[PDB]
Structure 1
Amino acid sequence: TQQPIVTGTSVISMKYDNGVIIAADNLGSYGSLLRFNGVERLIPVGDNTVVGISGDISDMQHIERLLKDLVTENAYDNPLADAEEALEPSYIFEYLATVMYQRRSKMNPLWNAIIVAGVQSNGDQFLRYVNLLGVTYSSPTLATGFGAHMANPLLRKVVDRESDIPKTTVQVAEEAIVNAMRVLYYRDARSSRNFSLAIIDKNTGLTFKKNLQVENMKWDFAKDIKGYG
């Protein structure tokens, strides 16, 4: 049994026609006490995958180290495939999954959720989910922790089904997530103004915008609420 102590919470993601957009807040809470701030937890793994991790901070840093070495193992040899056979999304995922399997057998879990999000050497969009439970599922959009009940309905306007992925451009996606973030920053205690956004595009690599803050906030209406009767 592990007790979540220093937790950060919420990671959102969706597909569009040419890649994925994953973004998560950066914020390390410790119950009510907000004890650490601006804690990066969008990790690049090569230049065609980001792995976004949520739940317990302590457990996170021990899955930041296992990724880093996973590249050193692959990079050995394969000299005529140091960019051709370099770690696919699909590899990075399975490996994590099956470690998270193995600690749940001893009932001492790495108490987290993981999103693996990247692009194949076919160009196929990729987006999967794994967590403490040992469930996996892939999806047209994806949310973690508290954004399963707020963030998911917003993105499911844009992506409904598999007819809509070629119609959804990357200007539209961009708008959608930022805006999605507005609602999380409102209704979630454990969420701040700082958020890191990553685009993995299948045609231009890893675009990593860091330390955007929320924009256009409605608080004028609030003057006019008075008492409660």
Structure 2
Amino acid sequence: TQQPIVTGTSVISMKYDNGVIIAADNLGSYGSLLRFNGVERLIPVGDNTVVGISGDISDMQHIERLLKDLVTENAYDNPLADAEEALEPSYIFEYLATVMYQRRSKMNPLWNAIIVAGVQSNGDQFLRYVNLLGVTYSSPTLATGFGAHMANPLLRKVVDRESDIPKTTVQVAEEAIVNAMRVLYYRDARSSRNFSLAIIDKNTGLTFKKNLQVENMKWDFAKDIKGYGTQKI
């Protein structure tokens, strides 16, 4: 049993008609101090999977190494490592889920909330969640920490049920993810304006966008707000 030190906030994600999108800002907080800004919390594994991690950063870096090792290992004595026997998102998830649960069961958790996003070899979208307790679940949309409260409500207005997936386009979807990031920047006191976004499309493959920024913010009305009730100037 430990206690997180350097942490990463929300990880939002959702699936559309041809794939899945996932995003996470680049902040690495240390309590209330927004200590590190060049932190990539999106771990690409292979080219059909992206792992978004939140929580303790040191533990994240650890899961990062496990993932690289998983790839190296899958390559050993495997002639179909870049074909029929390449890593699937579901394999990567089942593995991580296994570890998370074993560690919580030994009273020494990996203080994280993870979301595995990708596309299975047969084209199916893969989106599942796992945290320090080993708890797991899937939904057309998934978010951790703050995003679970502010992002999901927004994203669900696009994909409320399974039948909405085929009706949603990457454009519509990516738009939602990007607006959700803006909202989180407005209300999450542990968020950054810079973030990373990744798309895993069954036709276009993996697209990984770095250094994005919250844009189109409304702040002007703040000038009309003075005092806290009766003050006029």
Q: TM-score, normalised by structure 1?
A: 0.98
Q: Deviations over 1:176-211 (max 9, x none)?
A: 111111110000000011010101111111111100
2:153 and 2:132 map into 1 onto residues whose CA distance is 24
1:58 and 1:134 map into 2 onto residues whose CA distance is 18
CA RMSD in angstroms comes to 0.9
Q: Deviations over 1:45-74 (max 9, x none)?
A: 001100011100011011000000001111
Contact 2:8 2:41 in 1 (8 A): no
The answer for unaligned runs of 5 or more in structure 1 is: none
1:222 and 1:34 map into 2 onto residues whose CA distance is 24
Contact 2:184 2:191 in 1 (8 A): yes
Matches for 1:114-193 after TM superposition, within 5 Å? 114-193=114-193
Matches for 1:1-229 after TM superposition, within 5 Å? 1-229=1-229
2:30 and 2:181 map into 1 onto residues whose CA distance is 22
The answer for unaligned runs of 5 or more in structure 2 is: none
2:99 and 2:178 map into 1 onto residues whose CA distance is 33
Deviation at 1:81, TM superposition (A): 4.5
- Any runs of at least 4 consecutive aligned residues in structure 1 with deviations exceeding 4 A, and if so which? none
Contact 1:52 1:114 in 2 (8 A): yes
Deviation at 1:80, TM superposition (A): 3.7
Q: Deviations over 1:158-184 (max 9, x none)?
A: 001111111111111111111111110
Count of matched residue pairs: 229
Match of 2:181, SS state, is helix
Q: Deviations over 1:143-172 (max 9, x none)?
A: 001111111100000001111111111111
Q: Deviations over 1:99-149 (max 9, x none)?
A: 111111210111111111110111001100000111110111000011111
Deviation at 1:32, TM superposition (A): 1.3
CA 1:152–1:80 in structure 2 vs 1: closer, same or farther (change >3 Å)? closer
Contact 2:74 2:81 in 1 (8 A): no
Contact 1:38 1:194 in 2 (8 A): no
1:219 and 1:226 map into 2 onto residues whose CA distance is 14
Contact 1:119 1:125 in 2 (8 A): yes
Contact 1:123 1:202 in 2 (8 A): yes
Contact 1:88 1:120 in 2 (8 A): yes
1:186 and 1:179 map into 2 onto residues whose CA distance is 11
1:204 and 1:82 map into 2 onto residues whose CA distance is 17
Question: Aligned residues: percent identity?
Answer: 100
Deviation at 1:223, TM superposition (A): 0.4
